[PDB]
């Protein structure tokens, strides 16, 4: 709404902020581990912007899903470790390569899958630091005085994912694998199976608080704050 | 909510702002390129520029309407500062669904979907 001129940045203007991520539910079932895509630093060749390469990789248990900032390698593409929250700033966010797993000949990756993603823009901010690619002169008339020094046009939005409801739940209901779209109609080759699940609708983080010193009055230094998260699964199968 | 008096801008009161555009999904299929519409400078008690509705072939890379209308911002907004930079020197086009549907042979629109 309001970001008037002039602007006098500092050398460290980072802030302690938080947000709630994009909401994502999905489940993939197959006899082959899933294939995910993410953007990383490639090799190529001008400007000092890092070259982007689309990488495919096997989605392993514990990999981070996209949170609204895209499916990219934040550890290599954001060197300052401060553009995204700490739980993804040194990790890689992967998105399922639905097209590749659907176009594979035998269809061993995706017997069946469901997905429900949603997000909207909650707030609008801009980045601090040198703008690597300046706005060309044909897109604005130069200013003067207080508006002599142009402000950073390196915008970035904050996601949110609106609301979670029981009516939109994908789980706790049976799926019947009658006829798959691929050529493999649910045959579990190798006597093994792969179930990929993402569920941000149960992402509540419990706050724990320990008392270091008991006193008659409240003091901040008398307590330690911890954050814990739990996940509960119960996989049920019917085989023929 | 609040915009009390007095108030009068200076000579340069522009601000560094951002926004999220109107959401638009659409797909048109045909054997002829689609025809789009946009408002441009046409040809007197007011100095307001005359508006004319232009038809043109929508080319790959043209900007869709973002909520500020389907117009030539480069020619109708001379200050280059009323809309964000990705459309301030571009022309936003909207598919002329009525024209493409009313053409005799119907080569433009075999089928289409839209959600704005």
């Amino acid at each position, epitope marked *: 709404t*309001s970001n*008037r001129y*002039p602007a*006098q940045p500092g050398s460290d203007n980072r802030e302690c902020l938080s947000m709630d991520y994009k909401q994502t539910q999905l489940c993939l079932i197959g006899c082959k581990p899933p294939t995910g895509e993410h953007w990383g630093k490639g090799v190529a060749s001008a400007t000092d912007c890092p070259p982007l390469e689309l990488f495919n990789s096997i989605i392993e248990d514990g990999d981070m899903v996209d949170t609204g900032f895209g499916c990219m390698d934040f550890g290599t593409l954001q060197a300052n470790k401060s553009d995204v929250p700490i739980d993804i700033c040194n990790s890689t966010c992967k998105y399922p390569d639905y097209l590749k797993m659907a176009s594979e000949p035998y269809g061993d990756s995706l017997f069946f899958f469901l997905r429900r993603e949603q997000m909207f823009v909650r707030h609008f901010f801009n980045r601090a630091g040198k703008l690597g690619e300046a706005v060309p002169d044909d897109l604005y008339i130069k200013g*003067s*005085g*207080n508006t*002599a020094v142009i402000q950073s046009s390196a915008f970035f939005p904050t996601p949110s994912g609106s609301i979670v409801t029981s009516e939109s739940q994908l789980f706790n209901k049976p799926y019947w694998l009658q006829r798959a779209q691929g050529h493999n109609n649910g045959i579990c080759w190798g006597n093994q199976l792969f179930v990929t699940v993402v569920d941000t609708t149960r992402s509540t983080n419990m706050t724990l608080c320990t008392e270091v010193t008991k006193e008659g009055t409240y003091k901040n230094d008398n307590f330690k704050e911890y954050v814990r998260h739990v996940e509960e699964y119960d996989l049920q199968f019917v085989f023929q | 909510t609040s915009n009390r008096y*007095p*108030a*009068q*801008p*200076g*000579s340069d009161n522009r601000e560094c702002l951002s926004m999220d555009y109107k959401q638009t999904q659409l797909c048109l299929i045909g054997c002829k390129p689609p025809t789009g519409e946009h408002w441009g400078k046409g040809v007197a008690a007011t100095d307001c520029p005359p508006l004319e509705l232009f038809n043109s072939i929508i080319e790959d890379g043209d900007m869709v309407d973002t909520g500020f209308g389907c117009m030539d911002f480069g020619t109708l907004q001379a200050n280059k500062s009323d809309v964000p930079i990705d459309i301030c020197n571009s022309t936003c086009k909207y598919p002329d669904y009525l024209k493409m549907a009313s053409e005799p042979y119907g080569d433009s629109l075999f089928f289409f979907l839209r959600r704005e």
Partner: antibody
Amino acid sequence: EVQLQQSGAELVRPGALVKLSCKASGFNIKDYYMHWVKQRPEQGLEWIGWIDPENGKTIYDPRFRGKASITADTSSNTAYLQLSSLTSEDAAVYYCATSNYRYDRSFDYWGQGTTLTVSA
Amino acid sequence: DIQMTQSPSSLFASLGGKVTITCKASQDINKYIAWFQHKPGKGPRLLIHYTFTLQPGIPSRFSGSGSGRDYSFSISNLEPEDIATYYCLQYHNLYTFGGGTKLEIKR
């Protein structure tokens, strides 16, 4: 009736910290800019800085960026001027003043003044 | 960045006379100059903003003019309550006060 009451006669030994007050009455501090101006004895007026109390914006002259931590609390309708590591040169007369962005008339109202002397 | 050269540093004239102060800026300030009256023990009083716009309550005998880098400020029909120190000030880019001018009444 617009007023800008201001602290007066603060003497601190060199070199400690000092925080001057300036709370207004008759208008909201969140609405307008809060400026600070210095005046050394037998010298002219030197603009120190300005703060937007609505969001804590800070604008300083590059001379005073070092030892001028200016703040403002809208709840108390007050503006603060903090100076660290006071010297003999730092002793002067300080004023707070009101500015408006939507009606850019420079310095609408000035406080009565604060005299800062430094000795032991 | 922008400097303000105010001249002269002191003035003197009889009651009912006219005095003039000149301020030259180091660069164009786009007519965004103000003039203040500062009396000892008081706060500065804004007399003129935007080169030649008087504040409410300021007598018409105070006046200003100028453009670009050159500006002036005149006080006609001098009166005993005019004894003060007058400052010019550019507010085109941040703020920069002039050196000041000590006015005295000649008797």
